[PDB]
Amino acid sequence: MRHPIPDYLASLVTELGAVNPGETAQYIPVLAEADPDRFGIALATPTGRLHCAGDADVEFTIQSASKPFTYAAALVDRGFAAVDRQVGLNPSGEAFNELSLEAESHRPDNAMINAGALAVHQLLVGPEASRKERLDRAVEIMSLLAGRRLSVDWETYESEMAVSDRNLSLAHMLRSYGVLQDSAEEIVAGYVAQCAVLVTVKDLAVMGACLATGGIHPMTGERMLPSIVARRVVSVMTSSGMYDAAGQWLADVGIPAKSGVAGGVLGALPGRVGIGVFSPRLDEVGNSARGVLACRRLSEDFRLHLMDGDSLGGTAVRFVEREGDRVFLHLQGVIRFGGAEAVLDALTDLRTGAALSAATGGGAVHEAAAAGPIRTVVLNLARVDRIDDVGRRLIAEGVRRLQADGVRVEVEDPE
Amino acid sequence: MRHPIPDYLASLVTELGAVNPGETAQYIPVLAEADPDRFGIALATPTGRLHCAGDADVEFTIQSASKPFTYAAALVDRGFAAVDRQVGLNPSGEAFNELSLEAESHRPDNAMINAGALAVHQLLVGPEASRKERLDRAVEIMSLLAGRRLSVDWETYESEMAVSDRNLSLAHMLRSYGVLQDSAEEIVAGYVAQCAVLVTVKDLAVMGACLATGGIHPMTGERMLPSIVARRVVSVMTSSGMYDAAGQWLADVGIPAKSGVAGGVLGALPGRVGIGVFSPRLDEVGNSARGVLACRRLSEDFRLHLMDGDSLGGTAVRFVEREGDRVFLHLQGVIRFGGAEAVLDALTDLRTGAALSAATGGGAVHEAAAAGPIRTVVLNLARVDRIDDVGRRLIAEGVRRLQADGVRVEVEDPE
């Protein structure tokens, strides 16, 4: 059959496509003269599906939406300590206030604002890295998450450089406070090239999906980033992505995102989807008017929100059977604290010493109390996709306390 | 056997219990002279389990941690429009700045700060509600989520009233801007009594759990609040609960929470747990020193964080079987967009016109491609706990497109 989501997307494109308020970034001709009658959107899932509609295959410079990816590369290349000493985690407007540097021992507020992005670029490969290395590293992280080699639009780059006095102001002030070690010109050029990286709505969706999964690429299943790093990135996207409008945005949209002045909007909702949107015209605060409106629509219509209780929970326990002397407990899904906690409940509801469930979501945990004594328990993990360190330790300890009850425990774990 | 979580909690209490930095709220004798050598913690799960340790059964006034619950009651009693016109969604420090009222058409920044909490109390039952009704309503919402009738500590109340000049300042300024209609004294007294509601660490955990589940009480399974309301409440807890430290808190702890000056800390992580913590001494910014540190520990040790990709996803599809002519697709868990989306993939991977999975978390969606033509599909929902409107519509549309393929579809749905 035909998947309905791509259809929902086409509707939305047609709906919101009816109008085209605002205007394109006027500070440079390349963006000032860009065709405004363009509108695309993409939704990449964890499993690897990519739904889209409209101009979702049209390239445009990523601009600010590049900031979370370089942030991820910096945290990976230098570790949290080195990065947190140069970049804060406080939300704020893009407007620069010197008192903010003198504050919290000299460091821009966050990686989402330009001052922070400059500091992040400065930190890209290492203290002795060259300009070319940091630029390549920025292109590399973005390409790795997109799953294809990306190009830099040098035309937009040069156009931007001719009017980079502001970013130069920020860079020099950062140098003054010891946040930048290389030259203002060098760091600004690197950041400007970084923003000139070309991407389509589909790429942003895929890149967003890597972040939504905790660092796993949805198309290949390879871990591109550590989960803690991906977690920090989406965290700052949420608290600072939409600047001083972040609070209202978290509440009313609930989707961590970041817009770019070329018209692209990046979205990343943990555990659910990667979002890419494209629409040139910006609203009064510089965000893609339709891009931002499209995120708001998806949120409301699909009832998608960071505050959703969409967790495995008790469903971690596929089922529990008591054939006679032994008990068979099967697990499944992505097991972390929530699922592991439920498993511990199952092991405890046995005596080695319905409606409520469904009403909440305890899965087959209730089948534990329902299930001659019990001399052996079999934990089958065949249906379990993966388990984080926490889950492993909780279940490991759970198995340990079973034996302590003089109960035989066999863990059938194919892979 | 013995559940390990309560044991983890005991360790933590002993660990963090080793020291007791800071001091008790000195503004009133009742809190100034309270016994500082007290420390408890509780973790209530969605299914209905309640783990705890230390002084988790010792009552104390809820203070500020009452703000999200009255916020929930106001949104329920008056609807979003009526509340959003009097209360913003912008994070900020507790320090009052008049320009903030003149801003965004006269309304305090958010429900977590005192000015906002006063406006919320003002909105409690209705425009013609009496003082006694609004106070009862505040006690009622809190009792309903705790699952027991709560009492007001009138001794703490009176003690607070003798030094309520500041809250009176806020209330009068709000009246000046038309945010309050009743008298300053009346609204402040209501808010002060509201803060004097007595709770234990276990109650906060349970109350937090109601919010974590989207409004469902974990002990009975009854819906106490609409999901959108519970969602708005946790949203504001996250963006404003920790005031100007919210960004750093989201990133490093990732648990929406709110502390009270009596030493209580409330936590609510969607889909996973309700947190209650108690420890009298406050740090330099007025938060429970150990309470806040205990939340930070749970986050790091259990790897619990709002940015976790802990979702049902493809696990929504329990399994897919092709006996011969017909296909049997079984669903399970809490189905919302994420799970429903996966189901649509299953229905589409059939022709009516492994490692990658586990690597991500597609569950048994892959069994769709793996599964003479196909004349009938059976959707069994017996194992599905519940499904939100979005999921229902997506699956409803999915079934509709199957038939459109001239495929027989039977939905076995016991309950």
Domains of chain A: 1-309 (3.40.710.10), 310-415 (3.30.750.24)
Please check whether residue A247 is in contact with residue B232, taking contact to mean a CB–CB distance below 8 angstroms. Answer: no
| Sequence-distant (≥ 6) Cβ neighbours of residue A15 within 8 angstroms | A297
Residue B92 amino acid letter: S
CA distance B200 to B205: 9
* CA-closest candidate to residue A341, choices A372, A313, A374: A313
Helical segments of A241-334, H only: 246-252, 289-302
DSSP symbol at B282: B
Nearest-CB residue to B308 (from A88, A240, A270): A270
Element (H, E) at B259: strand B257-259
Dihedrals phi, psi of A66, to nearest 5 degrees: -85, -25
CA torsion, points B153, B155, B157, B163, in degrees to nearest 10? -150
Catalytic-role residue among A13, A159, A179, A191: A191
For the record, the structure tokens of B237 come out as: 């807890």
Catalytic-role residue among A125, A197, A236, A261: A261
Point out which residues pair with B328 in neighbouring strands. B321, B378
CA distance B108 to B86: 7
Dihedrals phi, psi of B318, to nearest 5 degrees: -55, -45
**Kind of pairing between the strands at B317-322 and B273-278:** unpaired
B167 labelled ligand-binding: yes
Which of A330, A337, A379, A413 would best serve as a mutation to test chain B binding (most B beta carbons within 10 A)?
A: A337
- How far A405 CA sits from the closest chain B CA (Å)? 7
Residue A188 amino acid letter: V
With H, G, I as helix, E, B as strand and everything else as coil, classify residue A45. Answer: coil
For the record, the structure tokens of B47 come out as: 């299914």
Which of A311, A393, A397 would best serve as a mutation to test chain B binding (most B beta carbons within 10 A)?
A: A311
Method of determination used here: X-ray
DSSP symbol at B94: S
Please check whether residue A224 is in contact with residue A275, taking contact to mean a CB–CB distance below 8 angstroms. Answer: no
Please check whether residue B328 is in contact with residue B43, taking contact to mean a CB–CB distance below 8 angstroms. Answer: no
What's the full length of chain A, in residues?
Answer: 415
Question: Cβ separation of B385 and A363 shorter than 8 Å?
Answer: yes
The count of other CB atoms within 10 Å of the CB of residue B349 is 17
**A191 counts as catalytic:** yes
Please check whether residue A295 is in contact with residue A257, taking contact to mean a CB–CB distance below 8 angstroms. Answer: yes
CA distance A203 to B299: 32
Helical segments of A45-89, H only: 67-84
Helical segments of A106-153, H only: 114-123, 131-146
**B64 counts as catalytic:** yes
Distance of CA A301 to the CA centre of its chain: 21
**B191 counts as catalytic:** yes
A357 contacts in chain B (CB < 8 Å): 47, 385
Resolution in A: 2.3
DSSP A81-93: HHHHTT-------
Which of A1, A110, A220, A236 would best serve as a mutation to test chain B binding (most B beta carbons within 10 A)?
A: A1
Query: Tokens 């929530």 belong to which residue?
Result: A338
Nearest-CB residue to B313 (from A271, A309, A342): A271
SS (HEC) of B285-331: CCCEHHHHHHHHHHHHHHCCCCCCCCCCHHHHEEEEEECCCEEEEEE
A318 contacts in chain B (CB < 8 Å): 318
With H, G, I as helix, E, B as strand and everything else as coil, classify residue A378. Answer: strand
For the record, the structure tokens of B412 come out as: 């076995």
Dihedrals phi, psi of A382, to nearest 5 degrees: -50, -40
CA distance A209 to A207: 5
**How distant, in Å, are the alpha carbons of A9, A294, B239 from that of B230?**
28, 24, 14
CA distance B106 to B87: 9
Question: Cβ separation of B308 and A91 shorter than 8 Å?
Answer: no
B195 labelled ligand-binding: yes
Give the sheet arrangement for strand B408-412, strand by strand: B317-322, B326-335, B376-387, B408-412
Q: What angle do CA B264, A306, B348 make, to 5 degrees?
A: 145
**How distant, in Å, are the alpha carbons of A130, A231, B105, B196 from that of A127?**
9, 25, 48, 55
**How distant, in Å, are the alpha carbons of A8, B253, B391 from that of A321?**
42, 38, 30
DSSP symbol at B48: S
- How far A62 CA sits from the closest chain B CA (Å)? 24
A160 labelled ligand-binding: yes
Element (H, E) at B334: strand B326-335
A191 labelled ligand-binding: yes
A66 labelled ligand-binding: no
